Amino acid sequence: FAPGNYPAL
Amino acid sequence: IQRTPKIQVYSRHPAENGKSNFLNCYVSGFHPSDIEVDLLKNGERIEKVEHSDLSFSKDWSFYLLYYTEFTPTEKDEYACRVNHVTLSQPKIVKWDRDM
Amino acid sequence: GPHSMRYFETAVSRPGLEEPRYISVGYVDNKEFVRFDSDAENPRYEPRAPWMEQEGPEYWERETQKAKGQEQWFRVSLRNLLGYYNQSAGGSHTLQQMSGCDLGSDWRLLRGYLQFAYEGRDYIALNEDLKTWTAADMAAQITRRKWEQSGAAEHYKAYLEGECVEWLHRYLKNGNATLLRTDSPKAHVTHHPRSKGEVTLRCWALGFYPADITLTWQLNGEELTQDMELVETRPAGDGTFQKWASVVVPLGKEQNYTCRVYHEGLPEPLTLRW
């Protein structure tokens, strides 16, 4: 169950 | 960064002439991922050769596993050739069964 | 013992193309159960594990959809990353990420994991408190500055502690037979002449699962740490692992040395010699 990064580097 | 690949040539099971085994070349600890790996038989590139998809470890270094179905013989020499940007020249590693 | 889930994501930019290559791989107890590759014909997470087949279209759909989201995330980040390190053009770059959660024998959370890396080096990692960040270098600081402002950590923290834990329990329930299994190692010793008055002794351990294992050499008592080459555990190709340890023993004097193998499925430490 993958994660989802929203704020970019 | 750049990390030279670590190479391990070995058979899935302990070798036994006339008996079907698997030849693996575990290339690991390298970076970047762009890598070139071949399995050799008596110095010739073995055509049909599979390998894991690609992954990396805690230290971010990548690792694959090249492999092929084969039947060891007393005189057949097997090796793995690897090329990475870290290598000035393709690094070959002989399969030392009696290891 | 412990259990875990990990998602190793890799994005590699490349010249002449604006779509970096994205490869995400999920593991359970360090075992591939899902994979996604932006270079495949029809990108989508694929089952890499037998117990993962029971997942319905809804499942794969959502998962794939997320991967699509990550690609953009990595496409962007890679871009900003280029600016942070005042890097040039038409070069190839790599941004990786590891996410996941560790669980104890009791299936209760132990650690939350999230950390990225640029060019094979550490960049930014969420600390074990799941609240603060640790920036490897100056650049990474800017990302932290921005990530603290957005309060991103709370979002990842939630995932790491809720959905990560919850979904691992499921996979563990489904992969019961595969994952929670154990294969005892099978050891043996080999001899070879190394120097003039010395000999190389190799302690072999084969066909064991999980990978974790301990091989030690010792002179009729205390253990040994000098001239003791221990090879990096490697995959056998059939799901089991292999590893060995060697030690430069003086010729003639050899049955004086012994090696022990430690491993889960082992009722008691394998002990043997030449």
mmCIF file of C-alpha atoms in Angstrom:
data_model
loop_
_atom_site.group_PDB
_atom_site.id
_atom_site.type_symbol
_atom_site.label_atom_id
_atom_site.label_comp_id
_atom_site.label_asym_id
_atom_site.label_seq_id
_atom_site.Cartn_x
_atom_site.Cartn_y
_atom_site.Cartn_z
ATOM 1 C CA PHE A 1 0.000 0.000 0.000
ATOM 2 C CA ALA A 2 2.166 2.792 -1.363
ATOM 3 C CA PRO A 3 2.544 6.275 0.188
ATOM 4 C CA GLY A 4 2.019 9.564 -1.635
ATOM 5 C CA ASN A 5 4.370 12.461 -1.039
ATOM 6 C CA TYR A 6 2.657 15.765 -1.755
ATOM 7 C CA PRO A 7 5.027 18.567 -0.813
ATOM 8 C CA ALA A 8 7.904 18.509 -3.318
ATOM 9 C CA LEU A 9 11.562 18.752 -2.394
ATOM 10 C CA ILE B 1 28.188 9.724 -6.038
ATOM 11 C CA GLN B 2 29.574 6.639 -7.779
ATOM 12 C CA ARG B 3 29.992 3.191 -6.267
ATOM 13 C CA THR B 4 31.771 0.332 -7.982
ATOM 14 C CA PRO B 5 29.719 -2.826 -8.278
ATOM 15 C CA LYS B 6 30.460 -5.761 -6.054
ATOM 16 C CA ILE B 7 30.242 -8.974 -8.050
ATOM 17 C CA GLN B 8 29.553 -12.551 -6.972
ATOM 18 C CA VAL B 9 29.497 -15.420 -9.467
ATOM 19 C CA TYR B 10 27.888 -18.607 -8.132
ATOM 20 C CA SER B 11 25.464 -21.417 -8.791
ATOM 21 C CA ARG B 12 22.052 -21.644 -7.179
ATOM 22 C CA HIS B 13 22.972 -25.042 -5.778
ATOM 23 C CA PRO B 14 26.304 -26.694 -5.133
ATOM 24 C CA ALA B 15 27.655 -27.671 -8.564
ATOM 25 C CA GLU B 16 27.382 -31.258 -9.750
ATOM 26 C CA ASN B 17 28.496 -32.090 -13.289
ATOM 27 C CA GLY B 18 25.765 -33.417 -15.517
ATOM 28 C CA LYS B 19 23.216 -31.908 -13.178
ATOM 29 C CA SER B 20 20.992 -28.939 -13.974
ATOM 30 C CA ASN B 21 21.793 -25.891 -11.874
ATOM 31 C CA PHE B 22 21.539 -22.131 -12.070
ATOM 32 C CA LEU B 23 24.330 -19.675 -12.706
ATOM 33 C CA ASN B 24 23.924 -16.382 -10.829
ATOM 34 C CA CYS B 25 25.890 -13.166 -10.988
ATOM 35 C CA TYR B 26 24.806 -10.998 -8.073
ATOM 36 C CA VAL B 27 25.903 -7.476 -8.937
ATOM 37 C CA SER B 28 25.378 -5.184 -5.948
ATOM 38 C CA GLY B 29 26.308 -2.037 -4.054
ATOM 39 C CA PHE B 30 26.647 0.111 -7.185
ATOM 40 C CA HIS B 31 25.506 3.641 -8.154
ATOM 41 C CA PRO B 32 24.276 5.064 -10.505
ATOM 42 C CA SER B 33 21.924 2.294 -11.574
ATOM 43 C CA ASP B 34 23.026 2.320 -15.230
ATOM 44 C CA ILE B 35 24.896 -0.984 -15.306
ATOM 45 C CA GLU B 36 25.838 -3.598 -17.905
ATOM 46 C CA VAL B 37 26.131 -7.274 -16.907
ATOM 47 C CA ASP B 38 26.813 -10.397 -18.971
ATOM 48 C CA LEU B 39 27.262 -14.083 -18.185
ATOM 49 C CA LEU B 40 30.028 -15.835 -20.119
ATOM 50 C CA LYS B 41 30.562 -19.433 -21.155
ATOM 51 C CA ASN B 42 34.058 -20.268 -22.354
ATOM 52 C CA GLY B 43 34.420 -16.546 -22.972
ATOM 53 C CA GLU B 44 31.319 -16.136 -25.059
ATOM 54 C CA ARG B 45 28.337 -14.063 -24.010
ATOM 55 C CA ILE B 46 25.449 -16.304 -23.076
ATOM 56 C CA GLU B 47 22.448 -15.264 -25.168
ATOM 57 C CA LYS B 48 19.275 -15.818 -23.144
ATOM 58 C CA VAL B 49 19.969 -14.528 -19.625
ATOM 59 C CA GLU B 50 17.450 -13.160 -17.163
ATOM 60 C CA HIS B 51 17.932 -10.980 -14.112
ATOM 61 C CA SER B 52 16.016 -9.383 -11.272
ATOM 62 C CA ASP B 53 14.283 -6.032 -11.939
ATOM 63 C CA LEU B 54 16.409 -3.547 -9.916
ATOM 64 C CA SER B 55 16.451 -2.424 -6.336
ATOM 65 C CA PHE B 56 18.665 -0.859 -3.754
ATOM 66 C CA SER B 57 19.612 -1.300 -0.120
ATOM 67 C CA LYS B 58 19.647 0.918 2.974
ATOM 68 C CA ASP B 59 22.772 2.622 1.691
ATOM 69 C CA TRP B 60 20.895 3.435 -1.553
ATOM 70 C CA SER B 61 23.285 1.284 -3.588
ATOM 71 C CA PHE B 62 21.530 -0.760 -6.332
ATOM 72 C CA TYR B 63 21.639 -4.520 -6.892
ATOM 73 C CA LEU B 64 20.500 -6.984 -9.538
ATOM 74 C CA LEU B 65 20.835 -10.689 -10.021
ATOM 75 C CA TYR B 66 21.668 -12.011 -13.449
ATOM 76 C CA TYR B 67 20.972 -15.707 -13.946
ATOM 77 C CA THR B 68 20.732 -18.660 -16.337
ATOM 78 C CA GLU B 69 19.864 -22.341 -16.326
ATOM 79 C CA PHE B 70 22.963 -24.475 -16.930
ATOM 80 C CA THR B 71 24.530 -27.913 -16.441
ATOM 81 C CA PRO B 72 28.087 -27.705 -15.089
ATOM 82 C CA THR B 73 30.777 -29.793 -16.726
ATOM 83 C CA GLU B 74 34.317 -30.583 -15.677
ATOM 84 C CA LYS B 75 35.870 -28.268 -18.262
ATOM 85 C CA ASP B 76 33.294 -25.581 -18.982
ATOM 86 C CA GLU B 77 34.487 -22.252 -17.654
ATOM 87 C CA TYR B 78 31.845 -19.682 -16.590
ATOM 88 C CA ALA B 79 32.284 -16.007 -15.757
ATOM 89 C CA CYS B 80 30.441 -12.747 -15.361
ATOM 90 C CA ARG B 81 31.431 -9.541 -17.097
ATOM 91 C CA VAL B 82 30.288 -6.226 -15.627
ATOM 92 C CA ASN B 83 30.529 -2.661 -16.834
ATOM 93 C CA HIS B 84 29.695 0.417 -14.837
ATOM 94 C CA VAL B 85 30.831 3.996 -15.095
ATOM 95 C CA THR B 86 33.055 3.308 -12.064
ATOM 96 C CA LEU B 87 34.999 0.692 -14.079
ATOM 97 C CA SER B 88 37.775 1.945 -16.355
ATOM 98 C CA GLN B 89 37.436 -1.403 -18.123
ATOM 99 C CA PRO B 90 34.878 -4.236 -18.040
ATOM 100 C CA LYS B 91 35.502 -6.282 -14.897
ATOM 101 C CA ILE B 92 35.325 -10.019 -15.435
ATOM 102 C CA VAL B 93 34.899 -12.528 -12.633
ATOM 103 C CA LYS B 94 35.397 -16.266 -13.043
ATOM 104 C CA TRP B 95 32.989 -18.771 -11.486
ATOM 105 C CA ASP B 96 34.992 -20.590 -8.851
ATOM 106 C CA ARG B 97 32.738 -23.552 -7.998
ATOM 107 C CA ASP B 98 35.203 -25.207 -5.636
ATOM 108 C CA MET B 99 34.875 -22.144 -3.444
ATOM 109 C CA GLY C 1 10.227 -11.529 15.343
ATOM 110 C CA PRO C 2 9.866 -8.139 13.608
ATOM 111 C CA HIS C 3 7.949 -7.472 10.372
ATOM 112 C CA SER C 4 7.969 -4.598 7.907
ATOM 113 C CA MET C 5 6.905 -3.071 4.652
ATOM 114 C CA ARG C 6 9.104 -0.890 2.511
ATOM 115 C CA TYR C 7 8.658 1.054 -0.675
ATOM 116 C CA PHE C 8 11.932 1.759 -2.449
ATOM 117 C CA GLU C 9 11.261 4.348 -5.119
ATOM 118 C CA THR C 10 13.803 5.422 -7.719
ATOM 119 C CA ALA C 11 13.586 8.233 -10.234
ATOM 120 C CA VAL C 12 16.337 8.701 -12.741
ATOM 121 C CA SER C 13 16.261 11.769 -14.935
ATOM 122 C CA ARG C 14 17.861 11.492 -18.364
ATOM 123 C CA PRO C 15 18.722 13.963 -21.187
ATOM 124 C CA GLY C 16 16.532 14.713 -24.204
ATOM 125 C CA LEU C 17 13.467 13.356 -22.415
ATOM 126 C CA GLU C 18 11.289 15.194 -19.874
ATOM 127 C CA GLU C 19 9.907 11.997 -18.339
ATOM 128 C CA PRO C 20 12.341 10.588 -15.765
ATOM 129 C CA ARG C 21 12.403 6.830 -15.371
ATOM 130 C CA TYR C 22 10.402 5.835 -12.295
ATOM 131 C CA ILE C 23 10.689 2.489 -10.571
ATOM 132 C CA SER C 24 8.888 1.783 -7.322
ATOM 133 C CA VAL C 25 9.220 -1.529 -5.486
ATOM 134 C CA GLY C 26 7.320 -2.700 -2.450
ATOM 135 C CA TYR C 27 8.610 -5.242 -0.004
ATOM 136 C CA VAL C 28 7.098 -7.058 2.940
ATOM 137 C CA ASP C 29 9.468 -8.489 5.522
ATOM 138 C CA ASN C 30 11.967 -7.590 2.849
ATOM 139 C CA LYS C 31 10.286 -9.491 0.033
ATOM 140 C CA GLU C 32 9.096 -7.953 -3.257
ATOM 141 C CA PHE C 33 5.311 -8.071 -3.553
ATOM 142 C CA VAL C 34 4.668 -5.150 -5.878
ATOM 143 C CA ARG C 35 6.505 -3.258 -8.608
ATOM 144 C CA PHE C 36 5.872 -0.356 -10.977
ATOM 145 C CA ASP C 37 8.034 0.785 -13.912
ATOM 146 C CA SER C 38 7.418 3.921 -15.948
ATOM 147 C CA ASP C 39 9.185 2.282 -18.912
ATOM 148 C CA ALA C 40 6.831 -0.750 -19.205
ATOM 149 C CA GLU C 41 4.304 -0.585 -22.105
ATOM 150 C CA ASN C 42 1.271 0.049 -19.887
ATOM 151 C CA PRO C 43 2.639 1.336 -16.452
ATOM 152 C CA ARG C 44 0.899 -0.121 -13.449
ATOM 153 C CA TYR C 45 1.848 -1.783 -10.176
ATOM 154 C CA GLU C 46 2.206 -5.515 -10.787
ATOM 155 C CA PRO C 47 1.947 -8.370 -8.289
ATOM 156 C CA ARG C 48 5.427 -9.692 -7.603
ATOM 157 C CA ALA C 49 4.158 -12.067 -4.954
ATOM 158 C CA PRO C 50 1.692 -15.002 -5.209
ATOM 159 C CA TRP C 51 -0.435 -13.905 -2.227
ATOM 160 C CA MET C 52 -0.878 -10.528 -3.918
ATOM 161 C CA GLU C 53 -3.091 -11.947 -6.676
ATOM 162 C CA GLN C 54 -6.310 -11.806 -4.650
ATOM 163 C CA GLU C 55 -6.256 -7.986 -4.892
ATOM 164 C CA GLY C 56 -9.112 -6.710 -7.057
ATOM 165 C CA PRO C 57 -9.076 -4.107 -9.877
ATOM 166 C CA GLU C 58 -10.018 -1.357 -7.440
ATOM 167 C CA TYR C 59 -6.791 -2.093 -5.534
ATOM 168 C CA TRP C 60 -4.333 -2.102 -8.402
ATOM 169 C CA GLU C 61 -6.127 0.937 -9.777
ATOM 170 C CA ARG C 62 -5.601 3.059 -6.704
ATOM 171 C CA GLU C 63 -2.007 1.861 -6.288
ATOM 172 C CA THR C 64 -1.108 2.591 -9.902
ATOM 173 C CA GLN C 65 -2.802 5.969 -9.667
ATOM 174 C CA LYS C 66 -0.554 6.859 -6.748
ATOM 175 C CA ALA C 67 2.532 5.795 -8.708
ATOM 176 C CA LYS C 68 1.422 8.223 -11.399
ATOM 177 C CA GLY C 69 1.356 10.857 -8.683
ATOM 178 C CA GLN C 70 4.833 9.953 -7.483
ATOM 179 C CA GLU C 71 6.281 10.255 -10.978
ATOM 180 C CA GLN C 72 5.156 13.890 -11.044
ATOM 181 C CA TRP C 73 6.508 14.308 -7.517
ATOM 182 C CA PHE C 74 9.874 12.915 -8.548
ATOM 183 C CA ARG C 75 9.772 14.750 -11.852
ATOM 184 C CA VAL C 76 9.375 18.004 -9.983
ATOM 185 C CA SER C 77 11.652 17.394 -7.015
ATOM 186 C CA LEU C 78 14.364 16.244 -9.421
ATOM 187 C CA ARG C 79 13.935 19.630 -11.135
ATOM 188 C CA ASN C 80 14.172 21.697 -7.942
ATOM 189 C CA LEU C 81 17.012 19.436 -6.813
ATOM 190 C CA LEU C 82 18.878 20.483 -9.933
ATOM 191 C CA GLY C 83 18.435 24.126 -8.952
ATOM 192 C CA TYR C 84 19.410 23.634 -5.334
ATOM 193 C CA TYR C 85 22.768 22.158 -6.349
ATOM 194 C CA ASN C 86 23.140 24.676 -9.161
ATOM 195 C CA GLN C 87 23.549 21.677 -11.469
ATOM 196 C CA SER C 88 23.652 22.020 -15.270
ATOM 197 C CA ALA C 89 21.809 20.330 -18.178
ATOM 198 C CA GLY C 90 21.460 17.067 -20.087
ATOM 199 C CA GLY C 91 23.022 15.054 -17.314
ATOM 200 C CA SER C 92 21.345 12.108 -15.679
ATOM 201 C CA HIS C 93 20.301 12.252 -12.011
ATOM 202 C CA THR C 94 18.933 9.940 -9.363
ATOM 203 C CA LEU C 95 16.489 10.643 -6.553
ATOM 204 C CA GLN C 96 15.501 7.705 -4.348
ATOM 205 C CA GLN C 97 13.086 7.274 -1.481
ATOM 206 C CA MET C 98 12.466 4.591 1.107
ATOM 207 C CA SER C 99 9.172 4.548 2.988
ATOM 208 C CA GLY C 100 7.596 2.073 5.333
ATOM 209 C CA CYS C 101 6.993 0.785 8.830
ATOM 210 C CA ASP C 102 8.565 -1.833 11.113
ATOM 211 C CA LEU C 103 6.478 -4.018 13.431
ATOM 212 C CA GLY C 104 7.278 -6.136 16.426
ATOM 213 C CA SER C 105 6.427 -9.804 16.837
ATOM 214 C CA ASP C 106 3.136 -8.416 18.164
ATOM 215 C CA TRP C 107 2.355 -6.546 14.940
ATOM 216 C CA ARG C 108 2.487 -3.241 16.798
ATOM 217 C CA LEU C 109 4.440 -0.343 15.316
ATOM 218 C CA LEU C 110 8.134 0.076 16.110
ATOM 219 C CA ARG C 111 9.379 2.600 13.589
ATOM 220 C CA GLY C 112 8.080 4.932 10.933
ATOM 221 C CA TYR C 113 10.387 5.347 7.943
ATOM 222 C CA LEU C 114 10.720 8.054 5.341
ATOM 223 C CA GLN C 115 13.940 9.345 3.824
ATOM 224 C CA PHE C 116 15.099 10.513 0.437
ATOM 225 C CA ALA C 117 18.456 10.566 -1.287
ATOM 226 C CA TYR C 118 19.864 12.480 -4.230
ATOM 227 C CA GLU C 119 22.728 11.075 -6.280
ATOM 228 C CA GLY C 120 23.113 8.121 -3.908
ATOM 229 C CA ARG C 121 23.657 10.361 -0.905
ATOM 230 C CA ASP C 122 21.386 11.153 2.034
ATOM 231 C CA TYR C 123 19.241 14.243 1.453
ATOM 232 C CA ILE C 124 16.366 14.406 3.933
ATOM 233 C CA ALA C 125 14.836 11.918 6.344
ATOM 234 C CA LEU C 126 11.867 12.116 8.685
ATOM 235 C CA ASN C 127 13.147 11.509 12.224
ATOM 236 C CA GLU C 128 11.854 8.659 14.379
ATOM 237 C CA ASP C 129 9.480 11.100 16.096
ATOM 238 C CA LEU C 130 7.607 11.403 12.796
ATOM 239 C CA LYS C 131 7.504 15.134 13.423
ATOM 240 C CA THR C 132 10.910 16.582 12.573
ATOM 241 C CA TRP C 133 13.316 16.297 9.642
ATOM 242 C CA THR C 134 17.079 15.800 9.309
ATOM 243 C CA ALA C 135 18.778 17.440 6.336
ATOM 244 C CA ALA C 136 22.018 15.843 5.201
ATOM 245 C CA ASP C 137 23.413 19.041 3.698
ATOM 246 C CA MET C 138 22.811 22.747 3.093
ATOM 247 C CA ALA C 139 20.461 22.226 0.156
ATOM 248 C CA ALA C 140 18.422 19.695 2.067
ATOM 249 C CA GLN C 141 17.921 22.475 4.630
ATOM 250 C CA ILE C 142 15.803 24.504 2.212
ATOM 251 C CA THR C 143 13.603 21.448 1.662
ATOM 252 C CA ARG C 144 13.325 21.087 5.451
ATOM 253 C CA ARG C 145 12.522 24.770 5.868
ATOM 254 C CA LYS C 146 9.722 24.357 3.315
ATOM 255 C CA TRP C 147 8.634 20.979 4.641
ATOM 256 C CA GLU C 148 8.328 22.316 8.196
ATOM 257 C CA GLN C 149 6.302 25.239 6.937
ATOM 258 C CA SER C 150 3.902 22.943 5.067
ATOM 259 C CA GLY C 151 3.815 20.532 8.010
ATOM 260 C CA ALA C 152 4.290 17.625 5.596
ATOM 261 C CA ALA C 153 5.522 15.341 8.355
ATOM 262 C CA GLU C 154 2.030 15.069 9.821
ATOM 263 C CA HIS C 155 0.799 13.691 6.511
ATOM 264 C CA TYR C 156 3.557 11.079 6.174
ATOM 265 C CA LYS C 157 3.338 10.389 9.904
ATOM 266 C CA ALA C 158 -0.308 9.454 9.438
ATOM 267 C CA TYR C 159 0.477 7.067 6.604
ATOM 268 C CA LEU C 160 3.408 5.487 8.383
ATOM 269 C CA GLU C 161 1.287 4.884 11.476
ATOM 270 C CA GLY C 162 -2.103 4.032 10.038
ATOM 271 C CA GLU C 163 -2.362 2.706 6.502
ATOM 272 C CA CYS C 164 1.227 1.386 6.512
ATOM 273 C CA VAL C 165 0.616 -0.675 9.658
ATOM 274 C CA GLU C 166 -2.904 -1.694 8.715
ATOM 275 C CA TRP C 167 -2.027 -2.865 5.190
ATOM 276 C CA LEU C 168 1.009 -4.778 6.417
ATOM 277 C CA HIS C 169 -1.195 -6.806 8.757
ATOM 278 C CA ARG C 170 -3.268 -7.786 5.744
ATOM 279 C CA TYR C 171 -0.370 -8.771 3.502
ATOM 280 C CA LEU C 172 0.960 -10.774 6.452
ATOM 281 C CA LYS C 173 -2.382 -12.493 6.811
ATOM 282 C CA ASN C 174 -2.402 -13.324 3.100
ATOM 283 C CA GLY C 175 1.278 -14.196 2.804
ATOM 284 C CA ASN C 176 1.074 -16.319 5.940
ATOM 285 C CA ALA C 177 2.589 -19.416 4.281
ATOM 286 C CA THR C 178 5.227 -17.559 2.297
ATOM 287 C CA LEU C 179 6.467 -14.797 4.607
ATOM 288 C CA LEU C 180 6.202 -16.151 8.120
ATOM 289 C CA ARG C 181 8.072 -19.273 6.999
ATOM 290 C CA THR C 182 11.738 -20.012 7.800
ATOM 291 C CA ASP C 183 14.464 -22.115 6.220
ATOM 292 C CA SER C 184 17.326 -23.336 8.417
ATOM 293 C CA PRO C 185 20.741 -22.769 6.918
ATOM 294 C CA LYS C 186 22.784 -25.678 5.599
ATOM 295 C CA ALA C 187 26.454 -25.252 6.484
ATOM 296 C CA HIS C 188 29.780 -26.797 5.485
ATOM 297 C CA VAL C 189 33.501 -25.889 5.523
ATOM 298 C CA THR C 190 35.989 -25.784 2.627
ATOM 299 C CA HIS C 191 39.793 -25.781 2.503
ATOM 300 C CA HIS C 192 42.315 -23.893 0.296
ATOM 301 C CA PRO C 193 46.018 -22.997 0.569
ATOM 302 C CA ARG C 194 46.479 -19.209 0.845
ATOM 303 C CA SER C 195 50.036 -18.240 1.792
ATOM 304 C CA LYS C 196 53.077 -20.351 2.563
ATOM 305 C CA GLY C 197 52.297 -21.397 6.123
ATOM 306 C CA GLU C 198 48.674 -20.347 6.010
ATOM 307 C CA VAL C 199 45.333 -21.796 4.879
ATOM 308 C CA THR C 200 41.937 -20.316 3.976
ATOM 309 C CA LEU C 201 38.900 -21.792 5.752
ATOM 310 C CA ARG C 202 35.418 -21.017 4.387
ATOM 311 C CA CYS C 203 32.252 -21.551 6.461
ATOM 312 C CA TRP C 204 29.249 -21.925 4.122
ATOM 313 C CA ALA C 205 25.571 -21.374 4.917
ATOM 314 C CA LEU C 206 23.061 -22.107 2.167
ATOM 315 C CA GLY C 207 19.357 -22.107 1.422
ATOM 316 C CA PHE C 208 18.084 -20.077 4.338
ATOM 317 C CA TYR C 209 15.186 -17.684 4.859
ATOM 318 C CA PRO C 210 14.910 -14.985 6.049
ATOM 319 C CA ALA C 211 18.188 -13.463 4.831
ATOM 320 C CA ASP C 212 19.274 -12.352 8.298
ATOM 321 C CA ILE C 213 22.023 -14.637 9.568
ATOM 322 C CA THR C 214 25.193 -14.700 11.666
ATOM 323 C CA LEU C 215 28.392 -16.503 10.720
ATOM 324 C CA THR C 216 31.341 -16.425 13.097
ATOM 325 C CA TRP C 217 34.772 -18.040 13.289
ATOM 326 C CA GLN C 218 36.629 -18.593 16.582
ATOM 327 C CA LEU C 219 39.876 -20.114 17.855
ATOM 328 C CA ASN C 220 38.937 -22.921 20.293
ATOM 329 C CA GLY C 221 37.080 -20.413 22.443
ATOM 330 C CA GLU C 222 36.917 -16.662 21.950
ATOM 331 C CA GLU C 223 35.698 -15.345 18.584
ATOM 332 C CA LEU C 224 37.858 -13.974 15.701
ATOM 333 C CA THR C 225 37.956 -10.531 14.045
ATOM 334 C CA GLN C 226 41.333 -10.423 12.294
ATOM 335 C CA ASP C 227 41.714 -11.525 8.656
ATOM 336 C CA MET C 228 38.142 -12.823 8.607
ATOM 337 C CA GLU C 229 36.478 -12.089 5.267
ATOM 338 C CA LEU C 230 32.693 -12.255 5.582
ATOM 339 C CA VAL C 231 30.960 -12.052 2.193
ATOM 340 C CA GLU C 232 27.837 -9.935 1.640
ATOM 341 C CA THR C 233 24.732 -12.121 1.982
ATOM 342 C CA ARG C 234 23.543 -12.929 -1.542
ATOM 343 C CA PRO C 235 20.328 -14.312 -3.153
ATOM 344 C CA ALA C 236 20.276 -17.924 -4.289
ATOM 345 C CA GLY C 237 17.582 -17.234 -6.909
ATOM 346 C CA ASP C 238 15.061 -19.644 -5.450
ATOM 347 C CA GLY C 239 14.085 -17.362 -2.616
ATOM 348 C CA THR C 240 16.686 -18.614 -0.160
ATOM 349 C CA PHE C 241 19.973 -16.892 0.639
ATOM 350 C CA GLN C 242 23.661 -17.744 0.864
ATOM 351 C CA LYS C 243 26.640 -16.367 2.724
ATOM 352 C CA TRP C 244 30.072 -17.458 3.918
ATOM 353 C CA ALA C 245 32.944 -16.427 6.141
ATOM 354 C CA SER C 246 36.623 -17.190 5.698
ATOM 355 C CA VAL C 247 39.583 -16.923 8.083
ATOM 356 C CA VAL C 248 43.358 -17.140 7.425
ATOM 357 C CA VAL C 249 44.374 -20.136 9.558
ATOM 358 C CA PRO C 250 48.014 -21.320 9.955
ATOM 359 C CA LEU C 251 48.613 -24.513 7.973
ATOM 360 C CA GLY C 252 48.386 -27.755 9.958
ATOM 361 C CA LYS C 253 46.607 -25.996 12.833
ATOM 362 C CA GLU C 254 43.037 -26.057 11.529
ATOM 363 C CA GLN C 255 40.668 -28.277 13.517
ATOM 364 C CA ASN C 256 41.377 -25.723 16.244
ATOM 365 C CA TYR C 257 39.038 -23.293 14.460
ATOM 366 C CA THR C 258 35.244 -23.572 14.424
ATOM 367 C CA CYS C 259 32.380 -21.581 12.945
ATOM 368 C CA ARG C 260 28.894 -21.084 14.197
ATOM 369 C CA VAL C 261 25.825 -20.168 12.222
ATOM 370 C CA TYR C 262 22.983 -18.267 13.886
ATOM 371 C CA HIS C 263 19.546 -18.145 12.326
ATOM 372 C CA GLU C 264 15.834 -18.039 13.221
ATOM 373 C CA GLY C 265 14.763 -21.414 11.898
ATOM 374 C CA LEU C 266 17.740 -22.858 13.711
ATOM 375 C CA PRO C 267 16.765 -24.867 16.835
ATOM 376 C CA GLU C 268 20.298 -24.153 18.062
ATOM 377 C CA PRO C 269 23.491 -22.604 16.517
ATOM 378 C CA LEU C 270 25.120 -24.696 13.814
ATOM 379 C CA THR C 271 28.696 -25.530 14.817
ATOM 380 C CA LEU C 272 31.247 -27.163 12.532
ATOM 381 C CA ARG C 273 34.821 -27.298 11.147
ATOM 382 C CA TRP C 274 37.229 -28.801 8.538
#
